[PDB]
Amino acid sequence: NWRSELYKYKVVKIEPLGVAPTRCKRVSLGFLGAAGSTMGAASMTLTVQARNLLSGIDTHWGIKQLQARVLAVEHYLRDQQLLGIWGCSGKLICCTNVPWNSSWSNRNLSEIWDNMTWLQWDKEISNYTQIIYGLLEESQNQQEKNEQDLL
Amino acid sequence: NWRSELYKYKVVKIEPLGVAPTRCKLGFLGAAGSTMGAASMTLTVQARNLLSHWGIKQLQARVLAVEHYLRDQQLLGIWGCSGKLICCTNVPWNSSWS
Amino acid sequence: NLWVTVYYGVPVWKDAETTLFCASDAKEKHNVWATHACVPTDPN
Amino acid sequence: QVQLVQSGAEMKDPGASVKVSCRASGYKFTDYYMHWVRQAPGQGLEWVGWVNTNGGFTKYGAKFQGRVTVTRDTSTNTVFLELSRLTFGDTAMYFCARPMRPVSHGIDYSGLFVFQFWGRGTMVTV
Amino acid sequence: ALTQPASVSASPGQSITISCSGTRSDVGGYDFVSWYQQHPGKVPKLIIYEVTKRPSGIPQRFSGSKSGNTASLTISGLQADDEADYYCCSYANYDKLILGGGTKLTVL
Numbered sequence: 001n002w003r004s005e006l007y008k009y010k011v012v013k014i015e016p017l018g019v020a021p022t023r024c025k026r027v028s029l030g031f032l033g034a035a036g037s038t039m040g041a042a043s044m045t046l047t048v049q050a051r052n053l054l055s056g057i058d059t060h061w062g063i064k065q066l067q068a069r070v071l072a073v074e075h076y077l078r079d080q081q082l083l084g085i086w087g088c089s090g091k092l093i094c095c096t097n098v099p100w101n102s103s104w105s106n107r108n109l110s111e112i113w114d115n116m117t118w119l120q121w122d123k124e125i126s127n128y129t130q131i132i133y134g135l136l137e138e139s140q141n142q143q144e145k146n147e148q149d150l151l
Numbered sequence: 152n153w154r155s156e157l158y159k160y161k162v163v164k165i166e167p168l169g170v171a172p173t174r175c176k177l178g179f180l181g182a183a184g185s186t187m188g189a190a191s192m193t194l195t196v197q198a199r200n201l202l203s204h205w206g207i208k209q210l211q212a213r214v215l216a217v218e219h220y221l222r223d224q225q226l227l228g229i230w231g232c233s234g235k236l237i238c239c240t241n242v243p244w245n246s247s248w249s
Numbered sequence: 250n251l252w253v254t255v256y257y258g259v260p261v262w263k264d265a266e267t268t269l270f271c272a273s274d275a276k277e278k279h280n281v282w283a284t285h286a287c288v289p290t291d292p293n
Numbered sequence: 294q295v296q297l298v299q300s301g302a303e304m305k306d307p308g309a310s311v312k313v314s315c316r317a318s319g320y321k322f323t324d325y326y327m328h329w330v331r332q333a334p335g336q337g338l339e340w341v342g343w344v345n346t347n348g349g350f351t352k353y354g355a356k357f358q359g360r361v362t363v364t365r366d367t368s369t370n371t372v373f374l375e376l377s378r379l380t381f382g383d384t385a386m387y388f389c390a391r392p393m394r395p396v397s398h399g400i401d402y403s404g405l406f407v408f409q410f411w412g413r414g415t416m417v418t419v
Numbered sequence: 420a421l422t423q424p425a426s427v428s429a430s431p432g433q434s435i436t437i438s439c440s441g442t443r444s445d446v447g448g449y450d451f452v453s454w455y456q457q458h459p460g461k462v463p464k465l466i467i468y469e470v471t472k473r474p475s476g477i478p479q480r481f482s483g484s485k486s487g488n489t490a491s492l493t494i495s496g497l498q499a500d501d502e503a504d505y506y507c508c509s510y511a512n513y514d515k516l517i518l519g520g521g522t523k524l525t526v527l
């Protein structure tokens with residue numbers, strides 16, 4: 001009876017942290033817009049996507065509200081913490097010092113940004129994302145911060 | 152009966168913040184037994200592990216983890232060290248501090 | 250040549266289960282499926 | 294110095310297809326996208342599309358999706374606009390254009406949406 | 420797609436504005452807004468880009484502005500050389516570029 005009402009709806013977790021090759025060396029309208037658009041075009045909407053990730057676009061209901069708010073804070077802070085330990089705490093587009101490994105993806109760069117969407121990219125890089133994060137954390141950010149502290 | 156199983160387990164609170172004198176202006180807790188400096192190249196592995204019988208107890212544990220993380224982030228921000236991991240604060244060492 | 254760039258706010262999602270809460274239109278405090286302790290919905 | 298040379302005007306019966314070339318020089322071909330726009334007589338200017346010459350990836354206006362194919366030849370530095378299923382409403386001057394800046398992928402697209410250098414344009418009559 | 424006045428006019432030496440109205444996703448949310456000039460029978464040229472910037476070769480009399488979801492081009496000191504069709508351009512919400520309908524400017 002409830003499926004007949006919820007048939008239109010799917011619950012998805014937003015993964016606002018993406019990694020992609022570039023040429024760098026270091027309102028809620030449109031909230032998930034450009035999801036079906038290619039990358040690049042979907043990189044110009046980061047401001048609206050980054051916002052509303054903290055607030056959004058009967059004991060039982062109160063506990064579900066508490067679980068929802070704690071979970072939202074937990075995920076928001078996991079993403080902001082990842083940005084912090086990467087040295088990206090408030091840049092929104094954070095260029096890094098990790099060279100791109102062709103073993104992760106070799107799509108001539110133009111295909112990633114002009115044809116490929118962020119969803120397709122996330123599906124293709126899901127097996128490497130943990131390696132990319134490891135290099136962002138263990139190698140370049142703590143080494144960069146130590147080097148900046150070698151006064 | 153449980154002590155005889157928990158004899159080798161201890162719960163410890165992780166204190167990711169610390170201070171050390173400098174001249175300036177291993178998935179989790181690995182290199183804890185290594186010397187400092189060498190253990191400063193394994194700081195993000197501990198930071199990444201922060202924020203990792205009754206639902207209220209689980210929520211209290213998760214809110215406590217969030218509060219401890221944010222207390223440490225508040226300490227970094229209030230010191231001007233937000234998001235830096237290694238931050239030189241220009242406060243002189245008082246010599247009596249070891 | 251190419252370097253890793255981190256983007257926060259990418260329109261990416263994965264199928265996931267999550268605790269859902271309730272919202273209601275205005276407020277009967279004695280309703281079985283109580284709408285008190287629910288957040289009001291947006292006017293639009 | 295930007296030189297954009299387009300093919301001559303073509304007459305086409307409704308339902309025919311036309312290929313409008315735009316050869317370019319004065320800049321590195323693969324560093325800049327090629328844009329196409331449509332200026333219909335007696336009315337305003339409509340955007341047709343763009344092609345990333347360094348990979349050949351294209352975008353089209355919603356009105357032009359499924360009717361227009363844009364390709365590029367990196368050996369002759371020439372971009373081709375192929376208009377299919379022409380109708381009477383497709384009579385227009387078709388211009389090619391060079392954007393103001395090279396596109397910095399994933400970082401800075403500000404120079405892609407500004408048409409800095411314009412070609413002469415060619416008529417398509419239906 | 421993009422709303423633009425059909426025509427504007429004023430006497431020589433007066434200051435006028437040409438409006439451009441899109442939605443939040445096209446003009447309000449992006450600063451990549453530009454203006455173009457087509458003299459009758461001539462190749463289009465760039466007047467304004469990025470709301471406030473001018474290319475080399477265009478005099479300072481053409482001053483762009485944007486507020487809310489509405490952009491405008493201010494032309495202070497109309498000359499007979501400026502009698503041209505003015506067009507507004509902006510980024511569309513996703514992967515697209517939208518143009519206005521064209522404003523015919525005359526000098527009275």
Ligand SMILES: *[C@@H]1O[C@H](CO)[C@@H](O)[C@H](O)[C@H]1NC(C)=O
Binds near residue numbers: 101102103
């Ligand atoms: C790239 O990836 C391969 C396989 O994961 C690895 O062996 C290699 O060391 C990586 N290259 C660099 C430069 O880190």
Ligand SMILES: *[C@@H]1O[C@H](CO)[C@@H](O)[C@H](O)[C@H]1NC(C)=O
Binds near residue numbers: 115349350
């Ligand atoms: C771009 O992606 C789409 C996805 O359906 C694919 O069909 C298309 O061929 C790709 N473009 C090129 C030029 O390969």
Ligand SMILES: *[C@@H]1O[C@H](CO)[C@@H](O)[C@H](O)[C@H]1NC(C)=O
Binds near residue numbers: 123124125127
């Ligand atoms: C990731 O690894 C799994 C291992 O089973 C494999 O099936 C999958 O195709 C891999 N995905 C990519 C994108 O390489």
Ligand SMILES: *[C@@H]1O[C@H](CO)[C@@H](O)[C@H](O)[C@H]1NC(C)=O
Binds near residue numbers: 182184185186
């Ligand atoms: C433990 O001490 C030995 C002493 O030789 C040293 O070689 C080793 O690297 C130390 N372990 C760590 C994790 O630092």
Ligand SMILES: *[C@@H]1O[C@H](CO)[C@@H](O)[C@H](O)[C@H]1NC(C)=O
Binds near residue numbers: 244247
């Ligand atoms: C150490 O701190 C005390 C105050 O607690 C101060 O009086 C003393 O001078 C300091 N010592 C040095 C060496 O700065």
